[PDB]
Curated annotation (Swiss-Prot):
It comes from the Eukaryota. Residues 4-108, 117-223 form the Calponin-homology (CH) domain. Transmembrane segments: none annotated. Coiled coil: none annotated. The chain holds residues 35 to 257 of 894 of the full protein. Expressed in both skeletal and cardiac muscle. One of its GO terms (biological process) is regulation of membrane potential. The lineage of its organism: Eukaryota, Metazoa, Chordata, Craniata, Vertebrata. This is Alpha-actinin-2. Belongs to the alpha-actinin family. F-actin cross-linking protein which is thought to anchor actin to a variety of intracellular structures. This is a bundling protein. Ubiquitinated by FBXL22, leading to proteasomal degradation. Residues 1-220 are annotated as: Actin-binding. The modification Phosphothreonine is found at T203.
Amino acid sequence: AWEKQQRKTFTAWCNSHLRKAGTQIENIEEDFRNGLKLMLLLEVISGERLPKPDRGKMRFHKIANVNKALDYIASKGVKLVSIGAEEIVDGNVKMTLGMIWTIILRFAIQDISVEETSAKEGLLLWCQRKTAPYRNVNIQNFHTSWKDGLGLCALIHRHRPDLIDYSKLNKDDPIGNINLAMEIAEKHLDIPKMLDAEDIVNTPKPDERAIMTYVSCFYHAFA
């Protein structure tokens, strides 16, 4: 179940940044194999230049590009334990998703600092602060706490009470709450839709990496 949610969310997140460099991906299991768009992604989210890409089609060219990306990531303190260029160049689905996660964590989440609390725990504390006035919300994690969509709706309402009538909402229609939050954030906050409501609500514990990714966009949009 987790691969499907991460593929949707991680692909949308990458595309929210790649659009700023004039390109998009479609199929995350194949569209980073040559390293070219992976290098582009890292340039957009960091503001730093990487070495010139190699546009040759043979394998050793792809290895060279992917290493530029992985070595850059490692220069930023990310310990790459189990990911190497070979896996990424070969289209390994698990490792590709794992690599995009460490990028999301390093560049979207790591530097979030809130009341002396950083990264995942800092983002959670931020969510807890912003949803405090809503008694029908209890953020205690990045999975089951978000299943009914009220959390997302409350984050929006807390910053932009003019965009959503929060008082109307309740737990009975969790599909609709998620879709409402996502449509509003897309149309008004420049945050693309990154979750599938149906995947989320009908999984006992939805994928926390996907949820963190999407929630981190709200953090940055409101900062």
